[PDB]
Amino acid sequence: MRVNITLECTSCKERNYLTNKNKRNNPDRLEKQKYCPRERKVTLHRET
Amino acid sequence: MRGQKMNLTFGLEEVYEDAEFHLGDFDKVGIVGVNGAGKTTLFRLLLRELKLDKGKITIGNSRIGYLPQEIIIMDEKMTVLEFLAEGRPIKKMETELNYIYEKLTVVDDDKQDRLLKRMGWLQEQLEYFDCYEAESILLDLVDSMQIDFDLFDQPISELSGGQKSKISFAKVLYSKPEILLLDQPTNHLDSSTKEFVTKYLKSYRGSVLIISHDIDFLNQIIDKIMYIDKVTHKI
Amino acid sequence: KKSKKMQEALKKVDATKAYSVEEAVALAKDTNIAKFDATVEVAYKLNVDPKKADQQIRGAVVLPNGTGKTQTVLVFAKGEKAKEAEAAGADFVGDDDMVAKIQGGWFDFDVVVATPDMMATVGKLGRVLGPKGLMPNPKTGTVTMDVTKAVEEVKAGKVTYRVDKAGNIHVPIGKVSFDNEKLVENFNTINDVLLKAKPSTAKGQYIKNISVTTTFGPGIHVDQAS
RNA sequence: UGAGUGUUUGUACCACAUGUACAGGAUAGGUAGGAGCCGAUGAGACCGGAACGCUAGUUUCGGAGGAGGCGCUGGUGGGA
Ligand SMILES: Nc1ncnc2c1ncn2[C@@H]1O[C@H](COP(=O)(O)OP(=O)(O)OP(=O)(O)O)[C@@H](O)[C@H]1O
Numbered sequence: 001m002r003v004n005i006t007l008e009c010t011s012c013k014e015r016n017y018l019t020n021k022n023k024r025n026n027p028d029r030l031e032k033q034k035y036c037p038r039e040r041k042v043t044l045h046r047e048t
Numbered sequence: 049m050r051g052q053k054m055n056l057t058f059g060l061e062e063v064y065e066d067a068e069f070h071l072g073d074f075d076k077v078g079i080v081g082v083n084g085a086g087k088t089t090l091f092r093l094l095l096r097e098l099k100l101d102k103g104k105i106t107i108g109n110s111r112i113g114y115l116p117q118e119i120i121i122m123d124e125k126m127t128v129l130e131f132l133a134e135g136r137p138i139k140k141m142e143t144e145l146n147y148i149y150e151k152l153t154v155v156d157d158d159k160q161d162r163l164l165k166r167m168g169w170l171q172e173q174l175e176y177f178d179c180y181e182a183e184s185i186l187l188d189l190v191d192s193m194q195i196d197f198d199l200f201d202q203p204i205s206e207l208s209g210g211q212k213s214k215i216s217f218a219k220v221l222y223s224k225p226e227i228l229l230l231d232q233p234t235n236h237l238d239s240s241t242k243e244f245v246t247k248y249l250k251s252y253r254g255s256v257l258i259i260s261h262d263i264d265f266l267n268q269i270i271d272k273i274m275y276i277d278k279v280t281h282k283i
Numbered sequence: 284k285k286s287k288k289m290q291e292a293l294k295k296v297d298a299t300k301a302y303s304v305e306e307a308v309a310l311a312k313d314t315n316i317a318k319f320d321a322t323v324e325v326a327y328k329l330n331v332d333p334k335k336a337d338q339q340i341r342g343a344v345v346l347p348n349g350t351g352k353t354q355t356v357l358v359f360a361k362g363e364k365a366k367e368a369e370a371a372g373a374d375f376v377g378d379d380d381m382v383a384k385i386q387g388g389w390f391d392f393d394v395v396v397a398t399p400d401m402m403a404t405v406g407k408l409g410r411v412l413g414p415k416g417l418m419p420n421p422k423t424g425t426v427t428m429d430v431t432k433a434v435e436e437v438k439a440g441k442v443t444y445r446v447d448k449a450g451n452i453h454v455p456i457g458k459v460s461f462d463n464e465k466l467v468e469n470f471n472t473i474n475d476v477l478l479k480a481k482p483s484t485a486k487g488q489y490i491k492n493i494s495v496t497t498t499f500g501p502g503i504h505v506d507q508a509s
Numbered sequence: 510u511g512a513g514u515g516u517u518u519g520u521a522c523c524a525c526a527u528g529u530a531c532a533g534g535a536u537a538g539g540u541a542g543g544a545g546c547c548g549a550u551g552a553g554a555c556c557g558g559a560a561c562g563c564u565a566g567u568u569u570c571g572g573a574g575g576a577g578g579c580g581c582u583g584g585u586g587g588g589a
Pocket residue numbers: 058059063081082083084085086087088089090117
């Protein structure tokens with residue numbers, strides 16, 4: 001089962017990126033290092 | 049206790065889907081469901097340990113007495129008395145209060161306002177949990193389930209499954225709670241011990257939610273039965 | 284069942300009518316038939332429930348007319364604070380070593396006050412004070428940087444008020460010796476401090492019932508507005 | 510579109526009764542006052558009846574009698 005997800009910056013809680021993931025292959029909430037335009041620096045973004 | 053549009057999904061396997069429930073006060077609610085249905089998970093939501101993915105779970109401000117399905121032994125060397133004493137926050141506040149006095153001596157005129165307020169609350173909170181409990185707990189064992197005092201000085205990890213259940217149940221009562229959340233309170237108890245638990249729960253004036261797989265035990269106490277469905281993910 | 288003096292006092296009082304402050308104090312003075320300098324006390328039944336941490340209240344209020352009974356003062360200090368107590372003329376002035384003597388000695392002192400630093404050392408003895416309730420508390424003001432203010436307040440008749448478990452708080456305003464006007468002024472001071480102490484989370488009417496009573500007499504209900 | 514009766518009920522006063530964990534003298538509900546309090550307006554002790562009761566005592570009504578007790582005080586207990 002593949003579904004679209006939103007990645008939110010853990011620092012400013014800004015819903016920054018849109019992506020998708022296969023729930024079966026990645027049961028746990030995805031986490032990436034992505035640029036946060038509000039803070040203008042790379043930060044940890046976690047799926048909500 | 050009320051929950052609306054409850055949603056919770058661990059990975060790919062979901063627990064609640066748009067579930068709802070309203071429990072009136074002073075209701076001895078019997079929670080029933082197959083293993084894995086999500087009965088323990090409901091309490092975790094009430095205790096705010098878990099958060100619903102979507103929806104609102106509403107709990108009253110009253111103090112809650114929680115009896116975990118599994119015994120929580122923080123350290124192997126913990127004694128039964130230490131385990132029971134941890135039920136009340138007397139020891140924790142005193143350690144904080146003792147530190148507050150230390151800070152007062154070090155700091156002269158900077159943090160006194162903050163320290164004085166913290167000291168006052170601890171004293172008022174300490175008196176609310178009357179420090180006379182040291183004697184009451186010692187005798188709560190006698191009147192509760194005939195728990196011998198030799199066990200009182202023995203490591204908790206060395207007790208038998210039935211003995212551990214008695215200690216954990218007494219700890220919940222020792223805390224003097226307002227709402228009782230009992231998760232299989234008679235898992236290992238023998239026939240004689242179950243009688244005391246049943247009588248106490250019949251007499252208990254407050255609200256008590258019971259997760260139990262013992263039909264006969266529930267029937268003597270329960271007035272409202274809450275069924276957690278495993279296939280419909282509803283309540 | 285009821286003494287004749289109490290019966291006549293009851294007939295004087297009107298249970299249905301909640302008197303004004305002036306009528307209530309005068310009526311209480313009339314009702315205390317017992318021929319001793321009884322202390323007049325006021326009891327407020329607050330809507331707040333103590334079981335909530337914020338709701339409970341515990342403080343101290345100074346009465347310009349006083350309580351009508353002098354209050355012995357015990358002070359714990361060291362150095363300039365000790366000199367402050369001596370200048371204030373505190374009934375008893377002590378230190379960390381003298382706390383042990385105070386335990387079992389000089390007892391019956393009405394109030395106990397300790398400096399912020401002395402509290403740490405005092406705390407050991409204070410656990411014994413706890414059940415007695417003498418232990419100084421910052422909220423009541425017993426713990427202050429200056430003991431002279433505490434001593435003068437105690438002499439004037441400062442009274443510490445603490446809400447009981449049921450939500451009723453009692454305090455003596457003065458002796459039947461004090462004139463009814465002085466007693467009413469003391470009641471007003473008590474009323475003002477309680478209103479200022481009303482907690483934020485409280486709701487509805489703040490006081491469910493206000494009753495003034497002498498040690499011998501029965502209760503008299505007093506109008507809240509008065 | 511108004512009268513009553515009765516029943517089962519929820520609320521709110523007013524009457525009452527109960528408060529036994531441990532130790533403690535013992536049936537200790539909490540807080541405030543409390544050195545004085547109560548009794549020929551019939552006290553103590555005593556007899557019975559009744560209620561409670563954790564069976565230890567508690568509370569209460571009556572019968573006689575007629576003036577005493579209780580408290581502070583004392584140690585216990587967190588609390589007298
Ligand atoms: N963090 C988690 N990660 C993955 N799955 C989980 C997690 N938490 C719970 N689950 C699943 O939730 C399901 C139901 O939760 P819960 O443990 O409360 O069931 P239960 O009814 O209390 O079990 P029992 O009645 O037998 O004690 C479990 O089967 C469990 O597998």
